[PDB]
Design a protein around this ligand. Structure first.
Ligand SMILES: *c1nnc([C@H](NC(=O)OC(C)(C)C)C(C)C)o1
Length: 358
């Protein structure tokens, strides 16, 4: 890495790891389109395994960005429309409150109060159907944004129905493979377990538990190298040869709703560049990010804006991730850690790095 990058990275991340007592960490900086890597600490403390450029981290909700692009790809393929009723792709969902709830609403958390989690008791196909069937909205569709695994998770399960493929097959075939993300997994295969970091929660080694719609909402695992490639692909979607994927990425970065200074895309969230750092740093606190907020519709959606800060935070029990990029500056960061530490600390650090290099 250019010494400019070494300097700000080292000055910023070392204190962060100490303050937050993070066991292990990988960072990628994308500068003028090119990736530069940094690793610290332990993927497995007990077995003294270092974090490397091949270590898999749980991405948590950064997974939603893959889900959004896969949905955008299916739109571009003509398989689905965001204007379509949810019930078009789930005929067994006959509950009357679903009338007027479209795929857009599901993708962008504006259905009317779908909850943050699918309940842990929802295991089977029958349970899943009964959960959505019996759900009663707090608000009308397209009025309030309330961040929800149950909203975008359902979007992702339904977006892949016309293709005949499972969510996992569609993700592999249509996104991971074309982009050469050869070390990104929804399910980590036995040969890769050697590289799968443990997460740490109150000193305990932990991995994400299975739950309904996990793959869609929070279930991807990936390395710092594949995550840099993902950033490169979203920075510059026009270098992508596969046409519907190229469109899908553009669609995931369109602005569908505004709340405050933030715009909701598919998975991705966007703000105009230059940004108020306090706004993205403070707004990342779950006390704000997870509260209901009124949305204004963008009619019709604004196509991907090059002068944007595009980002997503993500967590699991034992992991904390963050991705941010500015297409106009060809500039991005990926931060992957095996402790779930506060969101504002991630955004703060990412801003310091990107602002110095901008
Ligand atoms: C997306 N990213 N982080 C989160 C936390 N949600 C969550 O579902 O955690 C598990 C279930 C372990 C993945 C949330 C913001 C507290 O969701």
């Amino acid at each position: 890495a250019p010494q400019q990058i070494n300097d700000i990275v080292h000055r910023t991340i070392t204190p962060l790891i100490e303050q937050q007592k993070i066991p292990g960490m990988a960072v990628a900086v994308i500068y003028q389109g090119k990736p530069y890597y940094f690793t610290w600490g332990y993927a497995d403390i007990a077995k003294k395994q270092p974090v490397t450029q091949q270590t898999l981290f749980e991405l948590g909700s950064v997974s939603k960005t893959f889900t959004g692009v896969l949905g955008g790809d299916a739109i571009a393929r003509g398989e689905i429309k965001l204007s379509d009723p949810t019930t078009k792709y789930w005929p067994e969902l006959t509950a009357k409150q679903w009338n007027g709830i479209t795929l857009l609403h599901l993708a962008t958390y504006t259905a009317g109060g779908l909850p943050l989690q699918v309940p842990d008791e929802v295991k089977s196909s029958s349970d899943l159907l009964r959960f959505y069937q019996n759900w009663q909205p707090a608000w009308a569709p397209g009025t309030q944004r309330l961040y929800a695994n149950s909203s975008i998770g359902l979007f992702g399960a339904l977006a892949v129905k016309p293709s005949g493929l499972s969510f996992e097959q569609a993700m592999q075939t249509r996104v991971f493979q074309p982009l050469k993300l050869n070390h990104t997994w929804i399910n980590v295969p036995p040969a890769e377990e050697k590289n799968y970091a443990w997460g740490y929660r109150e000193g305990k080694a932990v991995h994400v538990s299975p739950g309904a719609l996990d793959a869609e909402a929070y279930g991807v695992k990936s390395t710092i190298e594949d995550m840099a490639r993902w950033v490169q692909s979203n920075l510059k979607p026009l270098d992508i040869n596969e046409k519907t994927l190229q469109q899908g990425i553009q669609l995931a970065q369109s602005r569908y709703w505004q709340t405050g200074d933030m715009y909701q895309g598919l998975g991705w969230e966007m703000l105009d560049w230059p940004v108020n750092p306090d706004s993205i740093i403070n707004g990342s606190d779950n006390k704000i990010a997870l509260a209901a907020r009124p949305v204004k519709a963008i009619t019709p959606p604004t196509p991907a804006v090059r002068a944007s800060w595009v980002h997503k935070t993500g967590a699991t029990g034992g992991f904390g991730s963050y991705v941010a990029f500015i297409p106009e500056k060809e500039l991005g960061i990926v931060m992957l850690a095996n402790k779930n530490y506060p969101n504002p600390a991630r955004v703060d650090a990412a801003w310091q790095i990107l602002n110095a290099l901008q």
